Amino acid sequence: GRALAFVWLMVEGAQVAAGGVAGYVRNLLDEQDALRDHLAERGWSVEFVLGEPFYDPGAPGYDEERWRRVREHLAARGGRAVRLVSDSDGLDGWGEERFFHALSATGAQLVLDTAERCDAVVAVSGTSAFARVPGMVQRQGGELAAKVLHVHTFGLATHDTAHVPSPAEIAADGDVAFWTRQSDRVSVGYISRYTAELYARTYAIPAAALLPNRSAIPRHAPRFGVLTEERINERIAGLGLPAEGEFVVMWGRNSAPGLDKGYHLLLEAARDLPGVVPVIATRRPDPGLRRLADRYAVPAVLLDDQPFTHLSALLQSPRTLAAAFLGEAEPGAVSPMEAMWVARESGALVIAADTGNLPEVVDDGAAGIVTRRTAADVADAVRRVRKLTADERRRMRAAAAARVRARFDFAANVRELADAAVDRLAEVS
Amino acid sequence: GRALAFVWLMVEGAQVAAGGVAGYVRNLLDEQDALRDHLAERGWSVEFVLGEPFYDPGAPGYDEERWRRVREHLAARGGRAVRLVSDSDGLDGWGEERFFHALSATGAQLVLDTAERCDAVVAVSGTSAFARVPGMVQRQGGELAAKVLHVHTFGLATHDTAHVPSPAEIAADGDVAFWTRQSDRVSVGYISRYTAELYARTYAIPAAALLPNRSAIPRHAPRFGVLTEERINERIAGLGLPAEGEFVVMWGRNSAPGLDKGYHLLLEAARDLPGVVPVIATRRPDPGLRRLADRYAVPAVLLDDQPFTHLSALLQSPRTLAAAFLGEAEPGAVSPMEAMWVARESGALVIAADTGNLPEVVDDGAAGIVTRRTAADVADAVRRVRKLTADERRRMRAAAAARVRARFDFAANVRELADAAVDRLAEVS
Amino acid sequence: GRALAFVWLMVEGAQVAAGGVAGYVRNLLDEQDALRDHLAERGWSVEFVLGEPFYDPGAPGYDEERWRRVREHLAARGGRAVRLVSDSDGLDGWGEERFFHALSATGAQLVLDTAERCDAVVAVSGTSAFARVPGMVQRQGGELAAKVLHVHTFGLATHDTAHVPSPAEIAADGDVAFWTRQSDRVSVGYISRYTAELYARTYAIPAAALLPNRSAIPRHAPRFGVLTEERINERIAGLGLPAEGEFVVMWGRNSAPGLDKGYHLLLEAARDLPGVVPVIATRRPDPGLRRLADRYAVPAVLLDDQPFTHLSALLQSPRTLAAAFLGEAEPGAVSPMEAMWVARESGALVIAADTGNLPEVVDDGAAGIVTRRTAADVADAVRRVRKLTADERRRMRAAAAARVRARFDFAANVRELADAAVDRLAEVS
Amino acid sequence: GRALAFVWLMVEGAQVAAGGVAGYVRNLLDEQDALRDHLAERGWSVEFVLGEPFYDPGAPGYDEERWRRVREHLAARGGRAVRLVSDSDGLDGWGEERFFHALSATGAQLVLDTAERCDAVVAVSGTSAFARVPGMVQRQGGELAAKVLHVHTFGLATHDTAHVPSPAEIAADGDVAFWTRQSDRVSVGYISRYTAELYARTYAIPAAALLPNRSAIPRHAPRFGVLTEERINERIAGLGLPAEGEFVVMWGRNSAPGLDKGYHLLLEAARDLPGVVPVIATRRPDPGLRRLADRYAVPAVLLDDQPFTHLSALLQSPRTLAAAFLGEAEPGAVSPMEAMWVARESGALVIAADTGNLPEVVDDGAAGIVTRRTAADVADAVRRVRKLTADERRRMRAAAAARVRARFDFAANVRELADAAVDRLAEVS
Numbered sequence A, B, C, D: 001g002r003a004l005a006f007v008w009l010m011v012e013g014a015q016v017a018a019g020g021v022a023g024y025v026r027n028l029l030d031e032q033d034a035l036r037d038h039l040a041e042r043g044w045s046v047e048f049v050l051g052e053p054f055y056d057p058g059a060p061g062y063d064e065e066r067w068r069r070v071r072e073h074l075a076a077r078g079g080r081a082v083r084l085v086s087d088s089d090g091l092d093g094w095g096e097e098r099f100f101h102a103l104s105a106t107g108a109q110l111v112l113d114t115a116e117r118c119d120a121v122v123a124v125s126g127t128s129a130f131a132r133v134p135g136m137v138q139r140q141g142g143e144l145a146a147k148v149l150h151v152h153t154f155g156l157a158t159h160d161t162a163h164v165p166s167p168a169e170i171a172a173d174g175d176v177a178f179w180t181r182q183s184d185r186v187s188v189g190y191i192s193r194y195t196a197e198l199y200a201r202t203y204a205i206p207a208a209a210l211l212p213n214r215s216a217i218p219r220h221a222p223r224f225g226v227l228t229e230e231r232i233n234e235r236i237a238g239l240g241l242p243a244e245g246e247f248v249v250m251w252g253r254n255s256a257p258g259l260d261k262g263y264h265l266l267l268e269a270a271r272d273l274p275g276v277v278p279v280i281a282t283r284r285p286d287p288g289l290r291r292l293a294d295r296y297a298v299p300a301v302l303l304d305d306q307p308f309t310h311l312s313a314l315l316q317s318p319r320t321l322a323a324a325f326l327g328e329a330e331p332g333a334v335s336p337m338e339a340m341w342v343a344r345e346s347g348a349l350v351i352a353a354d355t356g357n358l359p360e361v362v363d364d365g366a367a368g369i370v371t372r373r374t375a376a377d378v379a380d381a382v383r384r385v386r387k388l389t390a391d392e393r394r395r396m397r398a399a400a401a402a403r404v405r406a407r408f409d410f411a412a413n414v415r416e417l418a419d420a421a422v423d424r425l426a427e428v429s
């Protein structure tokens, strides 16, 4: 027989959950059984292995219940949840050389251990933290590395931000570029039209070493379900929301050194936005954003730790003008796809910065409003959105929802990932 | 039920054997079943797990069939032989920062994966390449680190050699010294009288933190069995030895910048001995040793790669006056022990430099001849041995052997480690 | 021709000045000409080199006009100020492996280049980030290294802190310990009794290798002048002090994961101390303390960026009951010294935590109050100050100012460093 | 005023001379004054600063006198020869990560301290050991970094050779590619048409980021002269050359992992091609090459530290019918340039492999023969050289001489780079 294993090496997703990488792992586990079936159809009996850095129960986003949840879920299926030694306190999911080198080593170890017992292995690594893994496996693992195919994904150091990546990130992502060009067993999995281009043109990665791992949402997941107006108003009851004004909603991880989500840009623009109350739902409490909203005399509603139930209500409420997405250069952000789909019938429309994957998601103006990353441009964009006729708005809202169907459907795209990996397994050997 | 695991982390011993670390592993496996028994009596159901850096089939000392034999030994006994990722080509078993950090991460990964399925673990770390394993486990293992006891052995960087150790070596041993002092779950396991005192005052390791892992041999193993006169000459025959002349023998690994066996000392000293032929059997052919043999034009037999069949025959021939161990800072050499035991009845007696553990092996003169590490004192020693009468020689031969029996037996010394280990498992929860 | 250089490798002091290390450099420069004359009496002409990492202008404590004042000061005595490349972005004066390694390389470069132009060097190195410097000069600097004497000072990795020191800090401080025992040209510079003893016993460092660099304050500086009661009040008037209440004062750098100043302990004790007003002049503003004070409902006053003229005023007021010093493990804090000296006439008495150099500073209870590091012990400590008779208070006050004169005069103490260095330089050829 | 500085960071060239890098530094300092005068005519007083690792006096290639000559040469001219801290003992001029990071850090420091006292600096970085100088200066230097143009040359890790480079090499050559794409103050100095092409299709480096540093030989140096056939056999004398009648010379270095020189194909096709008489060489005696020699049946001379005076003559005698250079992919080999120039009246005709910069040297067949790597191809090429036509090999011998004159003049090419660099110092403020 042939027994197949996906090794998912992810910096978050079981113990800790804050962003898209954790959400990718969550989407992964829900689609698992179906993918297993699909692959069985293609001759492979497939097991799932998950590797995530060991975390201190004190880390932002820790949740032991989730951990057990994921561990039990993979175990019943025949897979493992494994916590990998990084060489850190466990109190963060990122670092510099010593954190990357350790986590890569144990990541590569888990890939080879799994390959001893399997017939083939597809090792999906993500983030600069795991980027040295294909080079570590292909350089040293002999007969067992001939069983492994690498797909590396979620971020390569680029020149598309003002903040220059750390030497540690520059080095690890250059390592994986080298190995993608050097080993036919090592591919990049691009997540977006923007990174397939950028990684080809910054790192000289040939077309045959680029596999599709395109960002997507599982549209029919319950958390995206459409809501009646009674439940919408019930759900935002205790959000502290004003009774007057329309909303521009934003949410995500707090911008911190290194990644500039664009929240301050909405706050700057609310100064010249007379009917507009920004609602910024950040993951952790953000004392800094509050300091701005007061320095600008802007009456912002600042939330933290919101469930998606409340965020889904806000986006669906007829009081909500737009959801803004203002990141400096998102490689493959999925929050807009959720907005476009949760607001199928009612609520927000998307305002999307003109950088990273955002223009692709809003179809360059067709399914949403694109804006330059200046306060005046964001203020302009909101006015633009307000000036839309209800005939205009209803076909922009439809066009957005149609796109999430066509391009951003998680089961379609993870099948696109699985299918390419499996097909490539039958040509490298 | 409380399942115990010994995790053995060793730089060689399955894929590759050249020195005493690999002899440790070989002795360990051959003794495993009798340790199951002792530990069974103390209520522990013990299991052996072995971790060795991944090696390229092209490396010095590789052997695919030893590796398959060790792998099966452990697997039949419910344990595991695990090849470990380092950040290397796998062609050598040592390195700089990069090799030490990857191996210590993956060794720590293997300790933690093993605590996941066992009730306690004693992790025996060996050499600077695994010196960081205690802190990697004791900083991030959380509750899994709470069921692990660390014994780090086979070297701490010292100032007893000419070669100043690598900045990587100083870091790794400096790290494990720190953790030995900081955590009641991390101990240095000393391998000799000399090492136990030296590390104690070099690193301020408190006596409670020192554990016995004293070097020793399995005296009643076949390879040390005694030989008929007839059989001795059959083996001596094919090595090309001079028809006349007394023999002084040395064997071990080729000298290299980190380790100075005294091979050069014998050749320099050789001219001052009239009718002595030096026989020097190093692991791999030594072109450099030939050159002082031609400089002093001393008559010498330079063998490479001998089986212990032929080595034993040499150490037992009446044509052999002494075996020489002239290492500069041997921490815990077992070759003298092998010599004092392979020759309880006939043949060589041992010449030991007065540095490292050798004075302890010879009982400071009472079981051998101690010499300074100069070309002159070595000859003085050869001479002294010459002038021993059968009253003094037979007496010196017995003392040495009794000494092995009482201080350097493996079964007793590995149970001292095992007993010390288990005792320390209690007293820490 | 005997030209002598002191090379000062300090993590702050010229571009950036937040804490005691920067206090050191300032004291060094002011004492320079007085010191130069002392060394002129003893046969050397002296020159000062200062080596400080490169710093981005948007950084905590970055004063462009101080860098210029330091640069001109040194160059006018034929000296130099040099900024050193670390492999960092210049925003903070700290890091991990990458930071310590680059800074020590470029620091070791600055010593050797100086040793090319001078006949003798004393190279006084700063924190963990400069600890690799001795082994870097002495392993590779040949004849130039033979002209250098190293004094390493300001804190090693210890087990006196709940925060387990960073692998970078363990590895680096292990390294200089090795080199202290390896070369008579490498010495450790102790700054307190605590430091000395601790090093000797934890790091196994011989008494021959300990050189005095005991922390101290230049008590004739005008910034320690006794303030006249009209002048305290006018200075105090801006701070927002309540009209009632008696003050317990504190000031220093904001606490951070590396280092624990007890600011949150004083707020905790005030929960049991009605009428006591904590006055915590922190370096940057501390939102965390304000949230704490709000939660505990204690009437603390939280200042930031306070000048020492204003701090001196609080310390001298009759309204101020004590100054508190509550650091987890202060190696050689001069801040207690600053209090005991400024309040020689009138004002606070010192409450000192029983760890680090603090008990020695208050002479084990004969010069201030010594307390454990708990909320309740600290609240207890305040009372014992309050119940001291005005009689006993005058006795304490005079003793503390006596002790600064005897034990913590800066000028006497650097002389003691200089003489120890010159002596050691003579001794080793 | 405006003083310009060329800081040359080279792994060898003054203290140690073993390879083409040392040759580049040798030719450089000879043309210093011929560039000092040129650069004045563009308005710059230029100073030359040379940086090199601290070497141990016992290292291969060490010469205390060469280092004293270079130091004084530069000092005479207002420059410096600076020895650079690396994190090794200095016995090798290479390493993995300690070495590259420390060497690049002190290199960047050297550039920056030169940038401080100059108005503009052209920092020419050497191989992977200095690849990180460009980015350590452009991230932390700040103001002084805006006065520096970085030209990194002599090798980027690529995929042409069978050899996979070290992770340390990949990381540093990844780092410099990143800064080269990112900063207009960072350029790669290309040494061949082949290297310029390769760096763009492997590192996505645009030609706009290149500057010429094209590999060249100093034609007018006395060693390159033609001389008498009397001198031919006087310089043949003192060398044990069997006189079969003719030769196919292939001098070079070891054919080992990383640097295959292709001697094997020759040996093979030759011993097979009727009546051809191969000869070879080395730089230090190659015993495995001696092995290959004893292995087949054709003459081979083990040339050991043979001066340039001897080796030129070997190529020029009418016995030599051909010289072959069959490297793996030599990025910018200068020896075929040495062959074509030396045998311009009397000597050999150059045979080149079709890999690396070699087809550029021999003008794609007009000025030499170009042959695929395989030994049946090597036979076919040496077939068209023992067969030599008057209107053919007089016309190609003169093509080869004209090629070195047109493309590979060292005086021409360092001028090209200096002008290119000064030009690009404009266009960046």
Ligand SMILES: C[C@@H](O)[C@@H](N)[C@H]1O[C@@H](Sc2ncc(C[C@@H](C(=O)O)[N+](C)(C)C)[nH]2)[C@H](O)[C@@H](O)[C@H]1O
Residues within 6 Å of the ligand: A019, A020, A021, A023, A024, A094, A127, A154, A155, A191, A215, A216, A257, A258, A259, A330, A331, A332, A333, A334
């Ligand atoms: C399915 C999609 O949701 C998925 N492709 C997403 O992956 C992430 S990858 C990432 N996560 C953390 C980091 C480290 C990084 C950071 O925190 O930003 N920093 C620690 C270095 C700053 N990089 C993307 O951020 C996101 O846009 C999106 O592409």
Ligand SMILES: C[C@@H](O)[C@@H](N)[C@H]1O[C@@H](Sc2ncc(C[C@@H](C(=O)O)[N+](C)(C)C)[nH]2)[C@H](O)[C@@H](O)[C@H]1O
Residues within 6 Å of the ligand: B019, B020, B021, B023, B024, B094, B127, B154, B155, B191, B215, B216, B256, B257, B258, B259, B330, B331, B332, B333, B334
């Ligand atoms: C059972 C006994 O035989 C056992 N205790 C033995 O352990 C070894 S420990 C060691 N092995 C390799 C190194 C590194 C070292 C090397 O390879 O030599 N170098 C890589 C730095 C050069 N250190 C001792 O050498 C030996 O004496 C003896 O104590």
Ligand SMILES: C[C@@H](O)[C@@H](N)[C@H]1O[C@@H](Sc2ncc(C[C@@H](C(=O)O)[N+](C)(C)C)[nH]2)[C@H](O)[C@@H](O)[C@H]1O
Residues within 6 Å of the ligand: C019, C020, C021, C023, C024, C094, C127, C154, C155, C191, C215, C216, C257, C258, C259, C330, C331, C332, C333, C334
């Ligand atoms: C003249 C005297 O003031 C002098 N002896 C003082 O030196 C300093 S040394 C130091 N400063 C910063 C660090 C790094 C450390 C930290 O910030 O705390 N962390 C970055 C690792 C956390 N170490 C002492 O702090 C102080 O007590 C006192 O000894």
Ligand SMILES: C[C@@H](O)[C@@H](N)[C@H]1O[C@@H](Sc2ncc(C[C@@H](C(=O)O)[N+](C)(C)C)[nH]2)[C@H](O)[C@@H](O)[C@H]1O
Residues within 6 Å of the ligand: D019, D020, D021, D023, D024, D094, D127, D154, D155, D191, D215, D216, D258, D259, D330, D331, D332, D333, D334
């Ligand atoms: C003037 C010309 O001669 C000049 N451009 C030459 O520069 C050298 S650069 C180089 N030399 C040694 C190494 C490292 C290498 C080694 O030592 O072999 N290894 C340590 C990585 C193995 N890289 C080229 O080799 C050569 O072709 C030629 O371009």
Ligand SMILES: Nc1nc2c(ncn2[C@@H]2O[C@H](COP(=O)(O)OP(=O)(O)O)[C@@H](O)[C@H]2O)c(=O)[nH]1
Residues within 6 Å of the ligand: A018, A019, A020, A021, A023, A251, A252, A253, A281, A282, A283, A304, A305, A306, A307, A308, A309, A311, A330, A332, A333, A334, A335, A336, A338
């Ligand atoms: N409920 C909730 N979900 C969040 C919050 N912040 C982020 N998420 C989820 O995390 C995912 C992050 O998507 P993405 O745009 O890729 O974020 P990024 O990875 O940080 O760039 C989204 O699908 C969100 O649903 C939050 O505050 N509350």
Ligand SMILES: Nc1nc2c(ncn2[C@@H]2O[C@H](COP(=O)(O)OP(=O)(O)O)[C@@H](O)[C@H]2O)c(=O)[nH]1
Residues within 6 Å of the ligand: B018, B019, B020, B021, B023, B251, B252, B253, B281, B282, B283, B304, B305, B306, B307, B308, B311, B330, B332, B333, B334, B335, B336, B338
């Ligand atoms: N058969 C054989 N065994 C060897 C040879 N060289 C070393 N050994 C074995 O390797 C072991 C090394 O023991 P030890 O004295 O500690 O050497 P060390 O570990 O290198 O310091 C000994 O038990 C020897 O039996 C050899 O050439 N032949």
Ligand SMILES: Nc1nc2c(ncn2[C@@H]2O[C@H](COP(=O)(O)OP(=O)(O)O)[C@@H](O)[C@H]2O)c(=O)[nH]1
Residues within 6 Å of the ligand: C018, C019, C020, C021, C023, C251, C252, C253, C281, C282, C283, C304, C305, C306, C307, C308, C309, C311, C330, C332, C333, C334, C335, C336, C338
């Ligand atoms: N003016 C002023 N000086 C400060 C402040 N915080 C710290 N300092 C100075 O920084 C120095 C720190 O001394 P020390 O006790 O060694 O602090 P430490 O290094 O953090 O342990 C003291 O001399 C203070 O004068 C502040 O908020 N204002």
Ligand SMILES: Nc1nc2c(ncn2[C@@H]2O[C@H](COP(=O)(O)OP(=O)(O)O)[C@@H](O)[C@H]2O)c(=O)[nH]1
Residues within 6 Å of the ligand: D018, D019, D020, D021, D023, D252, D253, D282, D283, D284, D305, D306, D307, D308, D332, D333, D334, D335, D338
């Ligand atoms: N005198 C002498 N010079 C040599 C010898 N081998 C190489 N060289 C010099 O070293 C340079 C090597 O050039 P190159 O082809 O680039 O060598 P590479 O850098 O190792 O590829 C040549 O210009 C020679 O002048 C030798 O055996 N003797």
